[PDB]
Amino acid sequence: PVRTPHACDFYADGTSEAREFATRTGPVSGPVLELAAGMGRLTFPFLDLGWEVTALELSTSVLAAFRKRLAEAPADVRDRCTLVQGDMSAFALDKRFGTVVISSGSINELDEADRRGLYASVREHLEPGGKFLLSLAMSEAAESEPLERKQELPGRRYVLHVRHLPAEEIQEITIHPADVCTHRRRLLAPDQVVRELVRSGFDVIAQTPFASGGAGRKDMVLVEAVMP
Amino acid sequence: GPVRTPHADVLLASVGERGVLCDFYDEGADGTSEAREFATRTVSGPVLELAAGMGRLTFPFLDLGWEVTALELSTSVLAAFRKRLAEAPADVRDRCTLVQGDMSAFALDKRFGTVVISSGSINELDEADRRGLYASVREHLEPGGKFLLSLAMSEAAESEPLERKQVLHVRHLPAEEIQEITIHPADETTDPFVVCTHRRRLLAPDQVVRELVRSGFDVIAQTPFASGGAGRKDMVLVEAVMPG
Ligand SMILES: C[S@@+](CC[C@H](N)C(=O)[O-])C[C@H]1O[C@@H](n2cnc3c(N)ncnc32)[C@H](O)[C@@H]1O
Ligand SMILES: C[S@@+](CC[C@H](N)C(=O)[O-])C[C@H]1O[C@@H](n2cnc3c(N)ncnc32)[C@H](O)[C@@H]1O
């Protein structure tokens, strides 16, 4: 239990986010691997686009919920979805895919070392010319231009320029009855993940901001990465 | 090779053939006050200083009478320290113990009443290596001994995080930034116009504090201070102890 300065813990439809993934993939022949699929907040929208989806999830309990939802769906929908228990930071399906997909909530679950395991696992499950697509929440600090500081320093005079670039923040939530719950989660800057992707061998061909809920301020980025 | 910053991009473009871009840390043509912050918040006996470098802090510490063990990873840096230590008075020279080691995974046949590390040093370490540091420090602290850290504090790290309510309170807390610098001569001509760039890790002081608590320390004080004695307080002095 985290006792924030404002003192119980604390522990949305995926159609728009899913359509954004579909925009940045285009033709997609063959199956799509979705990492940390949860109970299908994105997977069901993906299936509705006609995609064949291998949905990977770590939790037994979450898998049961997903399986139940799938039993409730029409046969043609359920038939296009393959559920697999695994760890997105270290998995082996002995099988490659034209497209690999991961959501922001998912990637922000992993620390730095685990993200490297993720990147490497993905490399092993991409077919040549395959696409690795990520969505990433973008905070106010992450989208803003960094304030550059300038100082004149001395014999020879130099000008020093200093900027601080966003890398990682904590999203803190205190739930509050109006007349008290708690959560802190990781919030990586899209630019930080892009740096990490390049470092792990990927070329990042595009970063498209979008609105998670499909309207209003653009609060997310869709990153397309490919293997050279 | 070197980091190509937006301001560097435009400089080099508008300078042509005279322009040279290199990282700040290669071909490249403070201390006593940060040292005093440490001295102010501390001795019964020997101090351990981690990642001592060439002794920007260590020599100030030695001038206070301290027995210092200075741990450093780089062999050439240690050689350079040793050279500076050779020109030092015999009494200063005898109170200094130089040791080669990794501050993320080190083991000495000694414990200490005080262990110190500066901002530049802890920011060299990724998250995993920082956990290795905290565990190692705990093992080298005598009962009641203190772990003292100095931590650079950016403007975003210094500000009160912006809230947005709906009631649902949402704050975004700084955890880690990248400090990016660009340095060039104030003129334009010069003969060779060299532009230095560098990118480095810059942890939020509160993030390191969260990590220390998680690691088993009690953080008993955090005092902001100015790295050049005066001006904006751009640094925090953290004191941590083991509970018991
Ligand atoms: C914030 S949710 C995102 C789920 C979904 N893609 C969405 O957009 O709603 C993170 C999910 O990843 C799962 N998860 C956490 N770590 C995992 C791991 N290492 N491998 C696979 N799944 C993981 C959790 O069980 C949880 O269901
Ligand atoms: C920013 S300087 C700090 C030096 C000194 N404490 C000061 O305030 O001037 C970083 C120093 O840490 C050393 N270093 C880097 N990683 C290290 C490690 N894992 N263990 C010990 N020293 C390390 C480098 O060789 C360098 O001397």
UniProtKB/TrEMBL annotation, chain A:
S-adenosyl-L-homocysteine binds at R41, E57, D87, M88, S103. It holds the Pfam family Methyltransf_25. Keywords: S-adenosyl-L-methionine. Residues 32-130 form the Methyltransferase domain. S-adenosyl-L-methionine binds at R41, E57, D87, M88, S103. InterPro entries: Daptide_MTase, Methyltransf_25, SAM-dependent_MTases_sf. NCBIfam families: daptide_MTase. This is PCZA361.24. It comes from Amycolatopsis orientalis (Nocardia orientalis).
